[PDB]
């Protein structure tokens, strides 16, 4: 099923609760929260304290993407904060992804795994096929760290490979998604769409959300 | 001169613009922004993207405290974001402190340096005495990372030492400051007061801010 998730990194961080309400009001399915620690990626955004404050104001699904070096140390804080989805990077969980997925699920959060552009898609197959698997795979379509970057079409091959092997798996894409890039992504098989500037910078955000949904549903 | 700086780490992160404005209306001189990267301290809070959005909603002095391992990489982003004060930790700015101070000042921000409880106060004397010196020294009165911890009276010896040598230097304290601990800190010589839970958790925050200011001015 299609899930449109505005990237709050592109919203007014100073009026988060209002922005969250506005997005839900405009049709958003989830709110994508980019958590960066300045180490895994060269940018620092928000952490669990922000998620906790936001949860007090909304019941919306908070899709948290951990671009941090030590995701295991965020499981407890984010679960307490009220995170709904917890997506970690495959590049920093090579020795403990099994326990990490289990620890996330134990806390009632939906486990997901993300991969940077340079990481071969085959690396996440074991995580999708595990006894306790990830329930979402996030294919980054730009090098993670900043919004406003150029969509990388070559990443659609990863989306396609995943959709072919796993027809019911939630496949998310993040990086340059918007009206001009949604069709190729929807055709490739992506059903969860993270978009920032294309939604918040639009004259009609609600129309953009609907257009993204329609493209996915059309595929 | 006394400066009262509420610690936004204790505020409603989902209504930052409103909280900042409320603090200013209640008499806050500066807004203390704790930037933690999960590495220098075991917590991740907010980064330049949050500061940038807040600046669009306030003209208040944003006193940013960098509890990160690589402060040099935040100078440009925070300057663009509108930070007013940029305080780095002496424990991670080694051999690069002279350049760091110059880079901060070169970008229109006020340079400051902070020291954890375990760090001898003598460590910062050269920075205060340099040709292009720090303009504020932040004596942590709790181990940095979280709000609500117990004030450490023993840290007042650092404050006193600094005040004795530098009569006009801004000396800031952060950690457990409130009505019950301000007199001993004001007597020691601290004039810039960072307080979180004692202000955001108070029935009369305006009265608390005034009391903190009165204590400092009384000294």
Curated annotation (Swiss-Prot), chains A, B:
GO terms for biological process: carbohydrate metabolic process; pentose-phosphate shunt, non-oxidative branch. GO terms for cellular component: cytosol. It is an enzyme of class 5 (isomerase). It comes from Oryza sativa subsp. japonica. Catalyzes the reversible epimerization of D-ribulose 5-phosphate to D-xylulose 5-phosphate. NCBIfam families: PRK05581.1-4 (NF004076), rpe (TIGR01163). Belongs to the ribulose-phosphate 3-epimerase family. Binds 1 divalent metal cation per subunit. Active with Co(2+), Fe(2+), Mn(2+) and Zn(2+). Its main location: cytoplasm. InterPro entries: Aldolase_TIM, Ribul_P_3_epim, Ribul_P_3_epim-like, RibuloseP-bd_barrel. It catalyses: D-ribulose 5-phosphate = D-xylulose 5-phosphate. A divalent metal cation binds at residues 32, 34, 65, 174. This is Ribulose-phosphate 3-epimerase, cytoplasmic isoform.
